[PDB]
Amino acid sequence: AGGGIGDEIEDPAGDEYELYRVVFDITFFFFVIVILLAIIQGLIIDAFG
Amino acid sequence: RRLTAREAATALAALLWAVVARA
């Protein structure tokens, strides 16, 4: 997605579990995308170095 | 752990160990 699931869900603004879903989305987004693609980038970067 | 007052009065221990506002 490049942006987490949030473009590929129902809108979570319904009252039940809104904040629960939002921490879920943002935690998923942050952790997997930025940290692990950065791990990959840094690995080949350190390889050239 | 209680919606509106979740981060505040529902769980202050984890709110102090970390500082989240949605759990």
* Helix, strand, coil in percent for chain A, rounding step 5: 70, 0, 30
Name the residue of chain A whose CA is nearest to B7's CA: A19
Q: State the Cα torsion A20-A26-A30-A31 to the nearest 10°.
A: 20
Phi, psi of A29 (to 5 degrees): -55, -60
Six token digits for residue A27? 């935690």
Please check whether residue A9 is in contact with residue A1, taking contact to mean a CB–CB distance below 8 angstroms.
Answer: no
- Of B20, B9, B4, B17, give the one whose Cα is nearest residue A23: B20
Question: Which technique?
Answer: cryo-EM
How far from the centroid of its chain's Cα atoms is residue A40's Cα?
15
Alpha carbons A39 and A17: distance in angstroms, whole number: 32
| CB < 8 Å from A in window 1-23 of B | 3, 6, 20, 22-23
Q: Is B21 helix (H, G, I), strand (E, B) or coil?
A: coil
Alpha carbons A30 and A32: distance in angstroms, whole number: 6
Residues in chain A with CB shorter than 8 Å from the CB of B22 are: 19-20, 22-23
A27 touches chain B (CB under 8 A): no
Q: Is B18 helix (H, G, I), strand (E, B) or coil?
A: coil
